[PDB]
Amino acid sequence: VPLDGGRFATSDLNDLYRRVINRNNRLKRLLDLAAPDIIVRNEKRMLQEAVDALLDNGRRGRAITGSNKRPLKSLADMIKGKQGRFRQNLLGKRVDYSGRSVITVGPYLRLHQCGLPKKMALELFKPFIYGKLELRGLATTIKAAKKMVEREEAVVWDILDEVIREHPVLLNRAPTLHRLGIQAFEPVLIEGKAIQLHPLVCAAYNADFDGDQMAVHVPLTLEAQLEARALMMSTNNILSPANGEPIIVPSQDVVLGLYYMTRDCVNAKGEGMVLTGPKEAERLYRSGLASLHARVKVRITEYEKDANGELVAKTSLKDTTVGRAILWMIVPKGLPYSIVNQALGKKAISKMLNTCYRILGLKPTVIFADQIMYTGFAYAARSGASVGIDDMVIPEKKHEIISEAEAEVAEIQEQFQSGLVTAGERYNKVIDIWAAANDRVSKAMMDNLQTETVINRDGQEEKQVSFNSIYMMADSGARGSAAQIRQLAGMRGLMAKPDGSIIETPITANFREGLNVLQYFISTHGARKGLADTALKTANSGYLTRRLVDVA
């Protein structure tokens, strides 16, 4: 083919064919001319070699290189590899009617919606728009329709709004590890250039909003639209196919909000009032007359599903808090009150959703999941939870533990030079000592942190779980864990040399105190080892799953 610059671009098969033809013609010439036998033997070998290089290059030992430096690519090369026909153009291929962009959180969406930029939508649905511009008579011919669209007249936007309605689109994020990586959503047109994704579906996609991108595809035929709506729609995928457990699982901010709203506290505003149901609880809290944590007595009516599915109503006077009463207004009728009446963590919320599913069905759980998300965001924001540096408390007796362990190790090392202790004995003893010291420090830190608040209960003192923000993030299961907090406030611990051996002296400092040069250099070993492990482990995972998919 002619390149624009006047040059020509050619495939390699042209070259291989040319030399086969050349050798063949010259062999015919030689035989016609009655040559000596060594010459014709030479020609016969070279012809055979040319054919071999045509059919499969390099298998005959030495690959014929092109003009440049590199071997010519032959027919078998066009079939075989990862980049041959079979895997690259037949089993998976590039596609029309598709787009791609950065993702962003939209918290106002319902579980079956996704925000689609106006420009992407205008481009993807081009021919549909041409068709309905012609239908209404607004454009005589297709070329007029083009000019109408490229100048973006208002009727174009009205037509587009009428087109996308009820039309699902397919959202994909690579790598597509499991069948939940592709899901169908109903679009809502937005301005801007980023796709807005519902918060709850991030877990399935394994997506985080720090620069990821997703691809959008458009189903065209009626059958494609229907099976996007029936098989693939996001409200149809709430349980995982690997194990039976749900995948719509509220997470970081939702869990923090629900935890903060539900938890109870000592005497704070409004002890021992008696309330006519949750509505009064909300009216009290939002007027500033009571706190979310007050321990109050509220009148509550549960429903309970009968033998034949009837809902019997039961009314009673329960002991609860303002926060739990307010939360109860969301819960669909059919569930017991006992679900809400304890300080909810992550497990509790997931179990709440599972119960609602296996009792009531699908539609109530979808609506319930949304309302949980909305309430969790709202009250997490109203809590105003933050993170300062004073929030990472350090035990008052850390240095005592460290000094005792140091002196004891010093004496065991002094005892070594008496010859009473071999190398293995000393090494094992020192490691055991430092492990014990680490455990003591960690336990003291948790004791000081977890249940440290002393409150007057209208009189003398009382002891309750603390409202420290990092502890909240620990208990609620929002984001923290015990080990992370240990690193923030206890000791960072023991480290390992590049490969196996565990270094003798541990790191006694923590991130609030700050490491020194040598300790930082020590930790870098493990950091890089883990990071390289993940980087080079992804490929093995992929190859394994490919083999498994092909067998079965």
């Binding site: 291929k93 590039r94 029309d96 098989l231 933050s386």
Partner: protein
Amino acid sequence: VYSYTEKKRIRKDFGKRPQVLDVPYLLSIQLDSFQKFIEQDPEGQYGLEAAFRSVFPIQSYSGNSELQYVSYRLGEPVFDVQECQIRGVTYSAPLRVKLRLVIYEREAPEGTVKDIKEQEVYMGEIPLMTDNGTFVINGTERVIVSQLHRSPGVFFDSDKGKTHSSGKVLYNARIIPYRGSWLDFEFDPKDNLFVRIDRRRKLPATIILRALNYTTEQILDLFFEKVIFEIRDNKLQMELVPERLRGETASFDIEANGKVYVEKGRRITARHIRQLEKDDVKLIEVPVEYIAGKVVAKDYIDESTGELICAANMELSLDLLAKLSQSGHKRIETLFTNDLDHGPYISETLRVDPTNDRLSALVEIYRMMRPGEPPTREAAESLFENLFFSEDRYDLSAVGRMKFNRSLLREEIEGSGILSKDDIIDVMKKLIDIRNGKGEVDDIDHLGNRRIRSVGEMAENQFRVGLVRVERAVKERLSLGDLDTLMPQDMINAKPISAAVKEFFGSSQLSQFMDQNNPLSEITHKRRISALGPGGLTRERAGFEVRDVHPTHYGRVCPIETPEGPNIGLINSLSVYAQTNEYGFLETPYRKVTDGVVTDEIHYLSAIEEGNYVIAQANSNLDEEGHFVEDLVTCRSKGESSLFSRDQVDYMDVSTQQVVSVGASLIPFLEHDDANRALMGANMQRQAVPTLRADKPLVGTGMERAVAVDSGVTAVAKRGGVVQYVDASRIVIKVNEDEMYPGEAGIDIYNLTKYTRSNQNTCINQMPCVSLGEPVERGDVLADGPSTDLGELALGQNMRVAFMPWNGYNFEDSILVSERVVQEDRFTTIHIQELACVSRDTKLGPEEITADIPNVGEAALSKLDESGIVYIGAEVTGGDILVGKVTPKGETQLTPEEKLLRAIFGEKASDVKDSSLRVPNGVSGTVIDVQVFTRDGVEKDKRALEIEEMQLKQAKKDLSEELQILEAGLFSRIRAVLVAGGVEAEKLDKLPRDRWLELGLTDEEKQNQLEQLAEQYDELKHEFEKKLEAKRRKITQGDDLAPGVLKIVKVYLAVKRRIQPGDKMAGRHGNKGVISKINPIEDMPYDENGTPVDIVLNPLGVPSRMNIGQILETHLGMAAKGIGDKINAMLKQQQEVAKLREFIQRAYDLGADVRQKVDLSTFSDEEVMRLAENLRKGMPIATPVFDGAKEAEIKELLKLGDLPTSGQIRLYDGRTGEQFERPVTVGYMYMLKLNHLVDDKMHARSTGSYSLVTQQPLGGKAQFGGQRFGEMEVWALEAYGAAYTLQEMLTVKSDDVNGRTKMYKNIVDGNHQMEPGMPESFNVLLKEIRSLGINIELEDE
């Protein structure tokens, strides 16, 4: 004590340690290297001199003619750097070499009096390095990264079984030359020794020895120890060396003929050996049973007959012993085969060895190296010699020789490049020693074994390759033709040498586009050391071992800055203070400790040398210019850290920074960050995009001044003086008389680069920061680069953050920003791009650049010139025409309906296309300039020649200053001489300057000097004239172009890019995010006083990611802005100077034990007021890494500014007015805007262009392509039941041709049906398989 750019704004730092070394010049690693390549060194063999002296003189075959080397020289480059960039041509210099051809005489033996013909030869182009460390290749800035490769020498490694039940440890030794083939020895699992040449195939290891003309007896001699048996007419007696008996169960009793020593059954002890040793036992009458088992050394012939009774290396037998006795041999030299402490490996290899003599051994090697050829004598001889012992085919560079000798525990350092036979035998010796358990195995990752190549050395290597390629042709031509008529420049072809050099610079893997995001990326790119590249390790070959952090990296390479993904650990950055010794191994500085006192002598220690000593730590508490405070110190030795006494220390680290690189040294509170996030932060700083208005960091570390100055992107005063005139584009400066050179006038001109385009399409612009009349000293900043504030690095801008959850708009790493940030034009960037329209001449006719373009209404042609080019400054949007070009169209036969249509309406339908250049869709900007390039023969349009006229005007304008500044100096010398032969104080001054030459004094030497000066003025005139004519000729002459290209037009388009949801922002501590929403000002949370927060971040990102740098930085930033607000309030009350002085000074000396003492009293009132003006925006603070500002100091600083010491505030909700129930953290954090913009990333496609052979849509946003529906996605749809969407994705959307066009025409009609077909890719497959001669075809039904 402070320079003026410092008294403008002193940044308070909290560092406690006193610094000894200054941070060295950062780019030296580049510059120094290249200098060695060009520096004209007489004896020091570096670069061009070394290469020439290596090849030349080149001897002809007959020895009668030879070509001789004299010297070389670098010509002046024809084009300057700016011209090279605008013309797209390499910046280079011509290399000119003096050669001498000498022709001998046949008759006389060496009569060299026939012909000596000497002349200069042009021998290629050499690219030059700009003074910043970069090359300009084809008009683009390229950087060549240093390479880290395994040094030549010997390495003794082991692969311990790694697959065996035995788990045997297998030892091997490698010899690696600088240039040449590999030699490898190893053990077989059966303790046999084998050789590989160039990793082809094993041979038994003794063949190398035999090829070296060694007789079997001689081999057994040099390896093994000899044992002596006397025979006395009946007696078998052995000469005894006592310790030879160690470690053996007793066989019989051994009496030394006087008294029993070893009884049968007694285990032989050290006491027995000692008894033997003192008893001086020599000869033992051993039983005849003993020698049954040993091996004979020499060839024992029968002296009576001369026949081999037993030759070397056969196990002895009783009857053989008898025959030796009867033959008359009293002496028997058997072999010393004492188990594991000594080993019988050589003997066993000899027994397996098939070859017998030298010649058979050479034949064996020859048929191993070149299988299938007859092994003649001469061929084998020549092969072996050229293989390992020939000067031009093997080289252990002096580095390799030194490393070799020092691995072998030799004395000398310098030696021949070729391997002697002693070298091979010694390597074998040491390998065997390791096998028996004496020596140790080398560690291949040691930075004592890995060495770095810089650009000078690679370029020198490639030039040598080119020179050798010339050698062949020169030497053959010297032999055949007649030697009389020809001259040397006819013999040499320049093309191959320049071919090699330019191929290296342009196409190598180590020549890379330079990153011009900002100064930091530039510096950190010029300083990486890469393990990949030619002659180096590759991706798949790299295991886990080479990729980790070795204990010797301390202070040589950074541990926490390296890419993620596949290249982790393979690319890594040079640390701060590190440099390279003359061999090429990294080394780092240390303070020498004399007898307890820490001195100030700096010694640079290498990798292998470091482990010998005991090195203290950087933060060990020193005591008042003396010895250590503590009795016991923390140190490291032999790779292990432990505790030591004062007396045992030898060295101390220079500073706390010397571990980390530059990019990591810029992070404020590094010592509180988990390493995983520090790595990310270091990698992410390099991607920041420089915004409209530079803003200093309120929390820095003090390395910013050095980075900004050394990156070369500012304009730094060269010799100092007083500013005489400042413009937006120029600074002219009068020099102080002290450093005014005695010939010239003291005026320096600095021209500033304004609004040029970088590699990443950002804006480069310099702004003057000096003001007219100000005094400046040497080395301080006059202009600010792209992303530098008043002398300092300023990558991003610093914002009010609150740490709290909004209504789920910052869910996972998302960021919520206020509308104020958009209003203030913070984070607004400027992007410059090229657009080019090329007009060629086609076979039907030449295309042309015209404004007369078919099918276009005047609305579009509004913005075009008369000639069809855009007006400068016209604002364009997507789709507009930038230059009108039409191409001659062929003949177009249309279907009947167009015949009818044209007949109805009378359309002429002219024969010409519309190929004009238009703005890409979406882009919207302003045209800042246009450039036109015309071929030599083509006439110049109107537009092009008015551009030329404008350029002439500019050139004449500029050249006049250059003329005047030179007349001024010449007249200064004239007035300095004319007053010395008679002072005329005011007379000459008042009379005109010019007519001083028409005046003359007494006919002394004064008159002669006045005349000879007058003949300087006449050729200053000719300077002006020739230079002006050079400029006239350059811009009038037609540019050379590609063949077939008539003319080129380039349009530069400038786009102002604003922030919007979707963009990526980040801080310095590894925290990322995408803007999620832009709130109105009312909705943002607000303070007690009503000031709203600018950015809201999520708390849940700190505890688990575990980087606490964020929070400490936020508190310290709050404190710094607090002091700023005190200063501002004090200034708004319209003055009180003593109070400003007092408050500022107490703020400056707040710290606990800081080293920085700022005496404010010496400042005059005006400088104090100016300093207050600059601090009005906040006190800038500096907390160095690992020497930080600690928490109590932060709280004290907060108290000084009247802020809560806990760092948290009562914060209200801007939307309902209700207070948030808990205090929240508020403060200033330094945010960055990265180069991943949502504008560049959005893309959509309905239908477009399709590929050629496969017929699928193309890929990529440039080609308007579609997204790939890979294999995994297909599995996903398989996992549902979605068969119909699948069949859609496979047929009517990409390959099914008839299918896809039919379905378009359907969905236009509102039908929505498929009608599928057969993908073209499968038909292509089917034809490919049929072409293999395999019949595959579809069975019908």
